[PDB]
Amino acid sequence: ARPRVLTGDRPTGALHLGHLAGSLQNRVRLQDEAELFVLLADVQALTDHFDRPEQVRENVLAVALDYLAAGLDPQKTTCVVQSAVPELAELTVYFLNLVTVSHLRQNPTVKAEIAQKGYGERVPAGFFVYPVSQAADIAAFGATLVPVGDDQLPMLEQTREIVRRFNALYAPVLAEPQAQLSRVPRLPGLDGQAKMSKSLGNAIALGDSADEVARKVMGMYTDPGHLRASDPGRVEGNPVFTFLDAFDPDPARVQALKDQYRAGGLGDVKVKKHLIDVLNGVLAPIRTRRAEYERDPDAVLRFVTEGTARGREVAAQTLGQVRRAMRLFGH
Amino acid sequence: ARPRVLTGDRPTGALHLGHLAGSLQNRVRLQDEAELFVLLADVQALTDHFDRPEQVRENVLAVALDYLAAGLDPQKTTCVVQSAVPELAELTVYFLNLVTVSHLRQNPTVKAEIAQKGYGERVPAGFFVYPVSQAADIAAFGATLVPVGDDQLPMLEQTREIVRRFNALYAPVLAEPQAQLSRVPRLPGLDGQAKMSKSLGNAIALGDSADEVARKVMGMYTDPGHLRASDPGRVEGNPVFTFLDAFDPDPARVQALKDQYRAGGLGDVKVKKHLIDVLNGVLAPIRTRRAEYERDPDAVLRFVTEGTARGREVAAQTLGQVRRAMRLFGH
Ligand SMILES: N[C@H](Cc1c[nH]c2ccc(O)cc12)C(=O)O
């Protein structure tokens, strides 16, 4: 517990195996060698889900349950609800003056999302400027380390420009955050697509039953050219093997499996059955804690209402110095 | 009282004659005909003066003084400093999700302001966005009536739109403001321009001495082509007449000079000379009123502090409604 690390998830659905490999595991590690803060960004979730406020509301508790199921320690990690800390909002609006529409339009990651969203020009304002609300999140909690995939680096980098701009314009009161680069490639979807998502229908939820997990794995895309066991099959592009690199404890088995697959005679059945055993080893403990916490709804609530209290006070402090630094009337 | 009315100014310096005929005297009277709220657009002032925060701070107290001297009674008008009401920023954020960047792009007023400031695509985000920030101002204070210069109609119309869309998506807890058109269009500058502003240097502040006000009138643009008294002059384009037209109480008297001046026996001096006093007359009391308060500064601060408290009170009530209407987690 030395540098303050900030991370988060916009509450839009249940977390899945892609988040586990992509961020959860790394976060379970950080809670022990840093002060970890996780933001359930329901406000940000609203920049595009403003038409589904029920969906966002319901998932704040569900993801929380997921963080816990994943192994995030209530006594270690500060879980906070973005909605319950208006200080952030207050900061984003001040941050908006420190950034140009031109530079906000150039963010490649948001540009890409607007692209995949098919918005066109009809981009909802809140979404267009979310990178700054994120910057507000970072500075307000006074985080100095932020786990980031190269896809969020422009978000982080903008944050750096903002704090830099704020300190120089007013007073050097905000900490410049630093990135904690990558988590190695992103987990692909069951049918082999680049992205794993509930939406795409190709995900395995952390809460999926061991039976379900078995089934989903059984129907996984493999190698179009591999038609029968005897045949030789390709590993590259074959998610069954990508999953194995991200969760199989012993690469010796993995590498061995890979061999015999390119050779021939190693059908997808024998490989998949082995993924199932590795996934169940990774997921089982997570299933148990999830079910446990289901019996103790109050415990999940305590997890967030208290993280929030803490988060609220921290952000409250920062705005304090921000208000003073900006020379706001009465400060 | 009866309806809630919201009016305000961007604290960037002393108020001038334009504000007077622009609204000041208007609210003076609507001050007992309704619940009048006057917002010192502290924050909106930064989307333009984000590099000169000192300038703003200093002028909050200076404009408030201006307000009192202009006739506003502490017992009937709630003066509110925007920055001390963080609830407004909160609501601004939520509102951003209700409009598209392409819609903000076609606001005729902001576009004109933008072109004047030579920002180009390099428009600060906060500025490009101030229209909704104001809509938030309106909705948070529950204002049902909002005086508006011809020029601020687009903004007014945007507020209703956003309020409308908010009520449908979430719940009908916000009131659509209705406009109060004025007669006297944007008082022109001494320059002969369309705008009077300290920025353009063509203004007669409410604090200027009898000597100055007179000096300002004498250098007031009039009519080229009209070189010597004798000659026939024309009222179109002449600031002095459009000045009398807004500060002179005897219209028969006005339409009089309008005759002679088209003939040729009414020296611009004579016109000016008159008008100068018609201004000293409308300004006489204001001057005496300012001295009093200038000697009881404690009172000005009181006006601001008590009002701001009351106002936050109101904002807090609306946000709570808003927060539950949006089904934000926990409400
Ligand atoms: N009057 C403004 C600043 C402003 C912001 N919100 C409102 C609401 C109602 C007003 O009457 C004015 C304001 C200006 O002229 O920019």
Swiss-Prot record, chains A, B:
It comes from the Bacteria. Keywords: Aminoacyl-tRNA synthetase, ATP-binding, Ligase, Nucleotide-binding, Protein biosynthesis. GO terms for cellular component: cytoplasm. A motif ('HIGH' region) lies at residues 11-19. Pfam families: tRNA-synt_1b. InterPro entries: aa-tRNA-synth_I_CS (IPR001412), aa-tRNA-synth_Ic (IPR002305), Rossmann-like_a/b/a_fold (IPR014729), Trp-tRNA-ligase (IPR002306), Trp-tRNA_synthetase (IPR050203). One of its GO terms (molecular function) is tryptophan-tRNA ligase activity. It catalyses: tRNA(Trp) + L-tryptophan + ATP = L-tryptophyl-tRNA(Trp) + AMP + diphosphate + H(+). Induction: The level of expression increases 2.2-fold, 5 hours after exposure to radiation, and returns to near a base line 5 hours later. The keyword ATP-binding applies. ATP binds at K198. Its EC number is 6.1.1.2. A motif ('KMSKS' region) lies at residues 195-199. The keyword Protein biosynthesis applies. One of its GO terms (biological process) is tryptophanyl-tRNA aminoacylation. Catalyzes the formation of 5'adenyl-Trp and tRNA(Trp) but with 5-fold less activity than TrpRS. Increases the solubility of the nitric oxide synthase oxygenase (nos), as well as its affinity for substrate L-arginine and its nitric-oxide synthase activity. The complex between trpS2 and nos catalyzes the regioselective nitration of tryptophan at the 4-position. This protein may not be involved in protein biosynthesis. Belongs to the class-I aminoacyl-tRNA synthetase family. Homodimer. Forms a complex with nos; one homodimer of trpS2 binds one homodimer of nos. This is Tryptophan--tRNA ligase 2. It comes from Deinococcus radiodurans (strain ATCC 13939 / DSM 20539 / JCM 16871 / CCUG 27074 / LMG 4051 / NBRC 15346 / NCIMB 9279 / VKM B-1422 / R1). The gene is trpS2.
